[PDB]
Subunit: 486 residues, 3 copies
């Protein structure tokens, strides 16, 4: 009777702590390495495609952004790195990032007219500019209304809206900053004009800040936009003696989470995924991927490693810690192919290989739970990785980068070793299953047979195909074949 | 002589990497799961109970916050999620969070009169409002002084204080923003009024920003409060031609650490703990708890897991890697109950179970250090977990959340596996202690006895209760009982 | 034949999760602890040497920072803790820390006369102060002009530079806050001065913020500085009806990456490191360290642990899990000193110890990869650890601290255990290599010899120095010496 272990036509390599590229009977890849290649829906809900527009361009209504389709509900937003179509009329947007973050995800998001354009009878509401040229005549942000002096009188401008819409509302307004004192008068008549907005929480009065600036889109003026959320049943009151760029529309909101803005140059083509990547979608179950850090969804703890393969089987020797495998049992049996560990008897009747399915199961059973624990215990939530920072937020942006890298180095190390260890342990586990079988036999037979020391036992008597089957059976009978020596 | 291992009436389960809910002789819970249920002192030092007041309401002296007891020294602050009693007169508070954070912990904190109310002889110092109604007449923040024009003259208001108090001082001031031009004149006479504060480090001049706003507490006006720390021996100079809401009191400070603000709806009832939780106090020593993230004190690395139990004993088989346990030694001995591993002899004199205390000690010794290392090596400092962010600090707040979650996923995984591994290792350790004893015997006896293969040895001679005791004794005598074939 | 193991008069005590102190043969170090004391260079480049000058003292031209060596490159920047000479003339610097981080690494840095001082014809260009005394006449930051009135007039000041340098150019202007209205008319002859700076991306007005404040350097006034970065073929623009402090010089700035600022009081010493410290230059390849947390560059991780003793050789007790070492083979052989494991034969010819180099190699081979994996798999990038936060950025600064500590506790724990485990495993590995050799022999000899049970075998026949050599040879011959029983 001979003790030995499965061998086979496997070429797969695992790494251990003591040795690299070790060939094993069977392994398992826990690192997803491949992506869809296309941008797709995230839980059925599509993203908001902005093409070459920017969030500011979109919400203000830059005439170049007219051609947009806005599903009242989106899961993520796709914005180019540097959109062409932003503020067509030059200027700035206040707390822009905080707004970008706020409108990460919506459910839903619907535009409503709050201060109808033609209700400004005491003022001119037609001013446009080359900056926002259409076909190509002076035009302006579709959602905003440029109040100018009527004839030669800019009366107190007054507007107000009560949020009876049922959901919080995003409202944006502007303040124009002209090139010189005369442009100021030419447009709004009186200097020392002001724009004053007011809600239960907001209080702000703006005076036009004038300065000689270069030409951006042939404009020296500047429009400084600001925004607020109008709480439900709250009212917002505008009042201006000139220089205000009032809104015509408000935006009904309705959050329920916190997604993110994906920066890509692509264009969704309708697929799916619990996880989307700036490079393509991921379809997987493995505790790790290495595609891209800035994922959006429920994602396999992105690690910085080229591969992660767990040893499940034993070292594959052709022909350890416990001596059996690639040890005193010099080699493996290509012949045995119904299990990992087994016997091979030379009887009165041929034979013959037979795997000990019982101990091969306890191994397949265990090694399975090892693979699963390594996976199933990984924690996974919904998260958007990439955020936005202004040019004067370098430190904050860096703090955030160092934080991401920090967790990247940790999850990499951790995973990279959990593979090394655990392979060194999976292997020595098999080696211990074999040398454990070599003893389940030796300790049944005892002196009824001689121990060849190559894994084989030579019987000091006769063993029919019913005695052999009894040793594997786990039930021998030493108190019988005992009297039967030499 | 028979080799075997302890078994007993244990029902406790541990998990390993290869198998779940494995029954073991003895385990150990490292995860604290239960809390005090009440809010208590933290190192003897009590918190600051705010009830339904807010930090702004408290420090400004909202008349509704009059009924407060302020132990000059606190360890943490208890603030409702949304206090009723904040700024009774509507408005805003600048850098409010940065102030909340600053006054996390004090040692001590004492109020001093810095600009006595009645020293404003050239101005009216009695203006109140329905917003801050008392009994219920127009009133105002107890700690602030509302300067209004006297008769019909608002002379230059001038006040100043030199910090001779010995410790840094928190000082708050306001600027009122009226509804219209006339309210402005009605109150402070001259328009274009200003408020200018000055120290060695502070420099600020404010002009009232006016706008038509809705009514909050029946008020259209707004008071915008700001604050500074007055360094020791430095002086602060107020100067106003109207609109100023000067302080009457300053606040002596004195930090020495950085605690936090606990957001609860409870009310301390005098107990203790090195660790308090929004849900109750924790009394423990275990490396982990799962009660609540936002703890205050020195806290067991809060993990997101339902249980963490370490295997200390061996697999409990009634009636492995090394073959002994639940292997060739088919089962355990309910009979043996003075150790983990032992013998059982059938002699000329009854018998009888006897644990090998020596090897049972080396096991109890080792397994103890495993449990301790897992615990004692956990790093633990003082930390407050929850901080505050403004409505325009969404990103910052999210960055901070993703950071906490990040470490939560790590400490969870780490602990969750350290249990799996280390149980798979604690068990195979026992199995190796047994099969190691089976050899400490077999290798003494050799051919002087036969090896039954069930764990038992059958003597090829006589072994009195002094020979048996000699095998356990570790000192046999093969060169004696040798003469007696068989 | 005896199959004991190596040893030596060593008192190196390693650590395991079961045993506190474990005197062992060979151990390794992984926690580099030593550094120059030289502030060196990073990848070849020098720091910016600053002296008792602050980064603003410098750029502004505080005339105490003449005594300086400014260099067209830097990998970081050495700055004193509390520099001596910064703003001679008291003030504020807007977005200061957001600028420091910007210029913390550059390539290059060039100052260029951009706005010659004379060509201000209409104004005075020779304002100065004893706030800023040189020898010691009145003076002023030697890069700034305090435009004041000429005659009784302050004509509108207008400055313009269309950046033609080809490099982006950081430009810094300032704004004076006179002690009171009349000093204001004294210096600038008209309140309602405003200072307007505008570019393609920046637009700012600002008005004197006069307050009655204390003296800093006997100075009541304050100067407030604010910067920007004028892009290629853009053009910044000035306009002030008073109060401007203008640049005379911008700076060419070419960046390629991040970096930090090192708060030390030393001097760079011409040399080399790849990872700096406020207390010296680390050079190593180990995965960890514990010099200083505030590192700049490619460094090993910083863990809060005293000693990282690994393990590189069996346990020690000259005269485990596998029974051999400090077990049935009672002790080790001072005598054997050409390997870890070996034989010792008493033959017809003396003898004699001989290490089994083959199995001693597989051990030296493996244990090497364990040490290397533990090291070589540590991830290491370039990083500056310490950043700067304003006094009103307490929360942000704390968020960043808790983040560093967070990763410190993790890398400490992780490393602290990886040592415990892995030592418990290195040791039991040796113990398994021995008891594995004891079987490579026993299983060759079988009954041809008796098994003394102390590690030794006694031959039931004759074994010349060619038979002994054959057992170690791995090739015995049981089918020969079989004839010579008892
Ligand atoms: C110091 C002082 O003047 N206190 C007043 C207060 C303030 O002037 C006002 O709150 C600033 O906005 O006004 C009080 O009455 C406000 C009152 O105004 C009338 O025009 C109107 O009829 C009322 O509906 C109401 O708005 C106040 O209590 O707030 C009086 C208070 O003494
Ligand atoms: C440009 C100018 O007029 N500088 C003068 C300043 C300023 O008037 C004040 O500092 C304004 O705060 O005051 C001095 O006493 C000073 O600095 O020694 C005299 C100096 O010549």
């Amino acid at each position: 009777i001979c003790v030995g272990y499965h061998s086979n036509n496997s070429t797969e390599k695992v790494d251990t702590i003591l040795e690299r590229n070790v060939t094993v009977t069977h392994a398992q890849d826990i690192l997803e390495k491949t992506h869809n290649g296309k941008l797709c829906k995230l839980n059925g809900i599509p993203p908001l495609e902005l093409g070459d527009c920017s969030i500011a361009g979109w919400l203000l209504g830059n005439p170049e952004c007219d051609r947009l389709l806005t599903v009242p509900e989106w899961s993520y937003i796709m914005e180019k790195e540097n959109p062409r179509n932003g503020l067509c009329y030059p200027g700035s947007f206040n707390d822009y990032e905080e707004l970008k973050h706020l409108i990460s995800s919506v459910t839903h998001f619907e535009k409503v007219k709050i201060l109808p354009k033609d209700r400004w009878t005491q003022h001119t509401t037609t001013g446009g500019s080359q900056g926002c040229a259409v076909f190509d005549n002076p035009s302006f942000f579709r959602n905003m209304v440029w109040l100018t002096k009527k004839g030669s009188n800019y009366p107190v401008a007054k507007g107000s809206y009560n949020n009876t819409s049922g959901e919080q509302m995003l409202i944006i307004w502007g303040v124009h900053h002209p090139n010189d004192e005369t442009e100021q008068r030419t447009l709004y008549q009186n200097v020392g004009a002001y724009v004053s907005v007011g809600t239960s929480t907001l209080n702000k009065r703006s005076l036009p800040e004038i300065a000689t600036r270069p030409e951006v889109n042939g404009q020296g003026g500047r429009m400084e936009f600001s925004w607020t959320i109008l709480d439900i049943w709250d009212t917002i009151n505008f009042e201006s003696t000139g220089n205000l760029i009032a809104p015509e529309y408000g935006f009904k909101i309705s959050k329920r989470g916190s997604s993110g803005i994906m920066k890509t140059e692509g264009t969704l083509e309708n697929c799916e995924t619990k996880c989307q990547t700036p490079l393509g979608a991921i379809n997987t179950t493995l505790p790790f991927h290495n595609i891209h850090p800035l994922t959006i969804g429920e994602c396999p703890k992105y690690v910085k490693s080229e591969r992660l393969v767990l040893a499940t089987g034993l070292r594959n020797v052709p022909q350890g810690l416990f001596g059996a495998i690639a040890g005193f049992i010099e080699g493996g049996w290509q012949g045995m192919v119904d299990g990992w560990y087994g016997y091979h008897h030379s009887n009165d009747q041929g034979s013959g290989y037979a795997a000990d399915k019982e101990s091969t199961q306890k191994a397949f059973d265990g090694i399975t739970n090892k693979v699963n624990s390594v996976i199933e215990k990984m924690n996974t939530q919904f998260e958007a990785v990439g955020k936005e920072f202004s040019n004067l937020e370098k430190r904050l942006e860096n703090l955030n980068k160092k934080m991401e890298d920090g967790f990247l180095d940790v999850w990499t190390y951790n995973a990279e070793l959990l593979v090394l260890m655990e392979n060194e342990m999976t292997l020595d586990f098999h080696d211990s299953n074999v040398k454990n079988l070599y003893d389940k036999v030796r300790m049944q037979l005892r002196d009824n047979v001689k121990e060849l020391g190559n894994g084989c036992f030579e019987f000091y008597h006769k063993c029919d195909d019913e005695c052999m089957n009894s040793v594997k059976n786990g039930t021998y009978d030493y108190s019988k074949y005992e009297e039967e020596s030499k």
